[PDB]
Amino acid sequence: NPLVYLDVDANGKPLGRVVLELKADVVPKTAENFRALCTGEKGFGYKGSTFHRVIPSFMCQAGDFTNHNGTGGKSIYGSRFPDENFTLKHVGPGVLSMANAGPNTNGSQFFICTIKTDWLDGKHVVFGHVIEGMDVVKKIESFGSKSGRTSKKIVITDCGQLS
Numbered sequence: 001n002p003l004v005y006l007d008v009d010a011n012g013k014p015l016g017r018v019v020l021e022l023k024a025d026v027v028p029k030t031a032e033n034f035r036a037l038c039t040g041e042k043g044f045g046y047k048g049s050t051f052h053r054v055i056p057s058f059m060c061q062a063g064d065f066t067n068h069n070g071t072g073g074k075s076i077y078g079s080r081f082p083d084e085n086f087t088l089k090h091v092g093p094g095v096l097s098m099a100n101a102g103p104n105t106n107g108s109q110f111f112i113c114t115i116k117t118d119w120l121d122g123k124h125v126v127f128g129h130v131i132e133g134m135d136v137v138k139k140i141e142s143f144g145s146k147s148g149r150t151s152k153k154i155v156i157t158d159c160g161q162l163s
Contacts, residue, residue, distance in 0.1 A: 001128075002161040004038040004153045006046070008136055010152040011061045018112075019132035019162065020096055029077075029085045030098060030106065030127040030146045037063070039107050044074060046108070051154040054096060054144030060137060061099055061148070063109035063154065072100075073108035081106045088126035090117040094137070096128035114141050120131055 006018045011096035022031035049065035066072035075081050082104040088111055090097060097120065101108035114131060116138065130137060143151045 002027040002031065003131070004162060005157050005158075005162055006038070007158040008051070008107060009157045010143060011119070012155075014157075015154075016136040017133050018130060018136050020128050021131050022096075022128040023126075026087055027117060027125060027127045028040045029081065030084045030125050032148070033076050033106070033108070034096075034110065034127065035161060037044050039161050040159075042076055046156050046159045048140070049156055051140055051150065051156075053148035054140055054150050054154065055111055055146070056141050056144050056150045057115055059111040059113045059115075060140045061109065063099065063107075064107065070109070075107045079102065082126075083086045083125050085124065090120045090124070090126060092116045094130035094134050095126055097124045097126045097131065102123060112137050114138070 001024050002022045003091040004020050021154045024031035038137045040047055051060050051062040053061040053070055064070055093114050098106045099111050107126055140154055
């Protein structure tokens with residue numbers, strides 16, 4: 001399975017590195033989309049974009065590199081893509097899953113759970129998990145709010161593939 005990284009800053013100050021394992025063994029199409037958006041190999045992707053909606057005791061959401069507000073993004077497949085399967089579940093903190101706007105609306109937006117979000121099982125495609133840097137995710141979460149607006153600008157300053 002690929003390993004990818006997100007290096008995250010808050011108001012220009014480094015928070016550290018999040019390392020994610022992508023479950024290409026279970027959801028290959030969804031994993032590949034995220035992998036390629038981390039490397040930027042298609043000329044666009046996550047580098048320089050933000051965590052735009054962060055809600056404590058819920059999740060940290062990112063990946064809207066077109067509109068920066070939860071309305072946009074772009075997949076590697078030319079259009080929004082179907083829910084590949086719902087095999088993997090939102091079992092606890094560190095689960096990596098696709099944001100969406102209803103069924104079969106996967107793009108580039110994603111979230112990292114900070115609790116078990118089991119009511120999302122069967123609705124959002126889980127495709128990986130944090131293997132290093134959960135403390136970085138907890139720091140991101142600490143800048144969230146009930147509305148999801150962040151109290152500092154949380155930027156993916158670099159991202160890419162490790163292996």
